Write a protein that binds this DNA or RNA. Structure first.
Ligand SMILES: [Mg+2]
Ligand SMILES: [Mg+2]
Ligand SMILES: [Mg+2]
Length: 135
RNA sequence: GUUUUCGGAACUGAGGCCAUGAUUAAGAGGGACGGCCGGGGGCAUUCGUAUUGCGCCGCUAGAGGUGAAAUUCUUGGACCGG
């Protein structure tokens, strides 16, 4: 069920970890990034908008993704981590670290980590007003 | 008798003489000149991601928002990846 690769060699795919403050996306796709293998989110595991971005939902999503990818023959993963970016926050949400550790403990081999978040040169106007959000 | 002379003026042309006649260059100010200097200004040109939208491809059931939610977009493929 996948490529024919010797025991010593590992098949590589990239994993996009979109860690917003509303939920977390774990999205494994090919090295080229065009064909996807498993994409499950934190909202697909917890039925409560509160916990959509919790570390627990990210852990469950990462475990599901790692299991499906192992069933599909990929043993090594390339991690690229993204925050919301744009004019909004640049710090990744709480689910990123939990998802990374979850897919590490799931037997997956770890490639090289990279931080790919949209960093505007000089963006448009941020959503909040001149006085900003007041809550 | 009488036009000169003298006196007075104005208009004057050659001379001699003046120790011939211009204070200083403001820790005032202009204006020059030289090498620079600077997100100063105007015109044109060029690049950078990001945002939004569109086309195609993949897998897709959620995605968004919040203190918690709802309004809102979603198998007439939303969100995510290229
Ligand atoms: Mg002077
Ligand atoms: Mg529902
Ligand atoms: Mg897209």
């Amino acid at each position: 069920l996948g490529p024919q690769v010797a025991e010593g060699e590992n098949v590589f795919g990239v994993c996009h970890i979109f860690a917003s403050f509303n939920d977390t996306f774990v999205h494994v796709t090919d090295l080229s990034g065009k064909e996807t293998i498993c994409r499950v989110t934190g909202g697909m595991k917890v039925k409560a908008d509160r916990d959509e971005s919790s570390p627990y939902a990210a852990m469950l999503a990462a475990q599901d993704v790692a299991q499906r990818c192992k069933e599909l023959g990929i043993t090594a993963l390339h991690i690229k981590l993204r925050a919301t970016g744009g004019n909004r926050t640049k710090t990744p949400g709480p689910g990123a670290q939990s998802a990374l550790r979850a897919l590490a403990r799931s037997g997956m081999k770890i490639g090289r980590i990279e931080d790919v978040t949209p960093i505007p040169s000089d963006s448009t106007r941020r959503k909040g007003g001149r006085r900003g959000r007041r809550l």
